Each structure stands twice: as C-alpha cells, then as structure tokens.
Amino acid sequence: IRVACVGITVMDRIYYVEGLPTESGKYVARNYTEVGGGPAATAAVAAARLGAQVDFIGRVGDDDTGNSLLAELESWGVNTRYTKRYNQAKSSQSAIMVDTKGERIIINYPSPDLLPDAEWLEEIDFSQWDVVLADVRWHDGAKKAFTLARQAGVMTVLDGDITPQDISELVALSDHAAFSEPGLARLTGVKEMASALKQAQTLTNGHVYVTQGSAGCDWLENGGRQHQPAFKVDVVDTTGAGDVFHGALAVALATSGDLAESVRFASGVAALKCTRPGGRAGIPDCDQTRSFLSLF
C-alpha cells in the first residue's frame, strides 16, 4: 500500500521536573528527552510500522531541529523526500515540563518561517499513492492535497479534530472524515454525538466517524448507525493513540475496503500502542497487531 500523510511535524523537548514551575525563577530538570510529534507525522510512522510505502509531506526549517525531525521520520521508515525545507528558517517545536504526578506545562512555538502557502504541492504527482491522510493543523495543505488526490482519483482520509478554522469545505473533499468528539461538536454545534454524525454526513458524499476514546468509535453506513467497541487493555502511555488510529485506518481502508474490518483493525493498533511504553516506540507492526487481534 502506498500512503502519503500531509500536515505538521513538531519536535517535543520534554523536561522531567520535581514540581511544575508555577512561580518565576530558576529550576533544574531531573531528566530530558527529545521526541518528534504531530498528527500527520505520527500517523505516517504508524503506517510505516504496518509496512506501507509511507511519505510525509509537511514544512521544516534549515535549522538543527529540522534535521533532527526529518532524520527521526526516516529512521522510522517514513520517506521525507517531498517535505519542504525552508532556507534561513526555524522549525516548529515545544518545551514541555512533566511533574512526578504526570501533570504537563506545554510551551508550543509554531514557526512563522513555515508559510501556510500550499502551491508547493503542485510539484508532487499524487497518482503515485493509494491513500492521502491529512490533519487539520495546516488547513491550506489539507485543502490542496485533497483537491489534487481527488483529481487523481486517490482515497482521502481526514483527522477531523478541534481547529479554530471551519473544516466544512475539508469534510466535503474527504472520502472518509474521522472526527474527535470536540472536532465534531465544533463543526456541527451539536453536543449529542449521534445527532452530530447525522448532521456531518450531509456535508460529504464520503463516510463520517467519531472516536470517543473508551466508548470506542461510531460511524454512519447508508443512514445506519454502526459502532466498534474499544479493546479493554492495561493502558500505560496514551501518547499518540488518536494519530496512530488515523494511520492504521488509512492503511486498512486502502487494503480492505471494509469499513467495519478497517475500524476494528485501527482500534487494535491504537490499543496495542497504549500497552507498550515509549509513545512512538510502542507502535506495533502487521505481525504484533495480527497477534494482539487474535486475543479476540
């Protein structure tokens, strides 16, 4: 399966501290780790670990951070070839402080050097992939990549989360729009997930889904309400479950056109990742997955 992931890549700089700052002054971290993130980036890593030809299309700087981010993606088996590296530019990143009790302070810097312009996408031949997954954190890239992919007759999958911008026009370009409870609520202005999914369906000729963590995943199939329960597992690290689900769902939808099979498969990949520690290091492969899924 050939997969493209369009969206954002951010370097998390994690500082483990005795207590979260709270007041001003100098503090000393007991420990430090540098892990890449971003919805479309983690989704790509998931799809690669499941053994797809996976490409990540996003924006980085010509700085050390840019190099660190794209090198990690490659090391995970994600091709960075069509990612735009901007000259004399800083990449997006976050400083994160983490308490003993698991409480987090996040300072995100979205780099203004990485321009929202998405005319760069026209240089890419989109026919070369079976599915294009996009996140809603780079609206102009999502819209271009989906238009190109539709012109080429390629499958489109959206990670429809909470964003300030209206994603009505994006849901319409989506063959599969997989929302989050908040994402779906913002779009429809309806807080009852059932009614919302029905409202959302009217916006697209494609399929609509809402993920509710432990409550599992709901979706509409020809006006019929369908559901896949969440897998009861001993959760250890929930860092990127939603991103990993979208990655697996794209691969599964491309391989097995079956919605029900695809959603079960994704729910499993996500669940297995939550058991294994190390965030991106916890993501299973088509073998570790098939095995976990056999525990039925």
Ligand X SMILES: O=P(O)(O)OC[C@@]1(O)O[C@H](CS(=O)(=O)O)[C@@H](O)[C@@H]1O
Six-digit token string for 87? 């000259």
189 binds a second copy (CB under 8 A): no
Q: Does 242 sit near ligand X (CB under 6 A)?
A: yes
236 binds a second copy (CB under 8 A): no
Element housing 95 (H / E): strand 93-98
Nearest distance in Å: CB 103, ligand X: 10
Taking the complex as a whole, the smallest distance from the CB of residue 5 to ligand X amounts, in Å, to 12
Q: Which residues of 243-257 are buried (b: 16+ CB within 10 A; e: fewer)?
A: bbbbbbbbbbbbbee
Please tell me the distance from the alpha carbon of residue 232 to that of residue 216, in angstroms, as a whole number.
Answer: 10
For residue 13, give the DSSP letter: E
Q: Which of 23, 26, 88, 222 binds ligand X (CB under 6 A)?
A: 26
CA distance 184 to 190: 8
Q: Does 42 bind ligand X (CB under 6 A)?
A: yes
Q: Is 13 in the site for a second copy (CB under 8 A)?
A: yes
Token readout for 112 is 């203004």
Is 130 labeled as ligand-binding? Answer: no
Among 23, 119, 123, 125, binds a second copy (CB under 8 A): 23
223 is in an annotated binding site: no
Nearest CA among 176, 155, 180 for reference residue 39: 180
Residue 156 contact among ligand X, a second copy, none, beta carbon within 5 to 8 Å by kind: none
* Identity of the residue numbered 169: E
Amino acid residing at 4: A
Q: Residue 49 or residue 137: which is nearer to ligand X going by CB?
A: 137
Place of tokens 């073998």: 287
Q: How far is the CB of 163 from a second copy (least distance, A)?
A: 8
Tell me: does residue 240 bind ligand X (CB under 6 A).
Answer: yes
- Residues forming contacts to ligand X in the complex (CB under 6 A) are 8, 10, 12, 26, 28, 37-39, 42, 94, 106, 108, 137, 161, 240-243
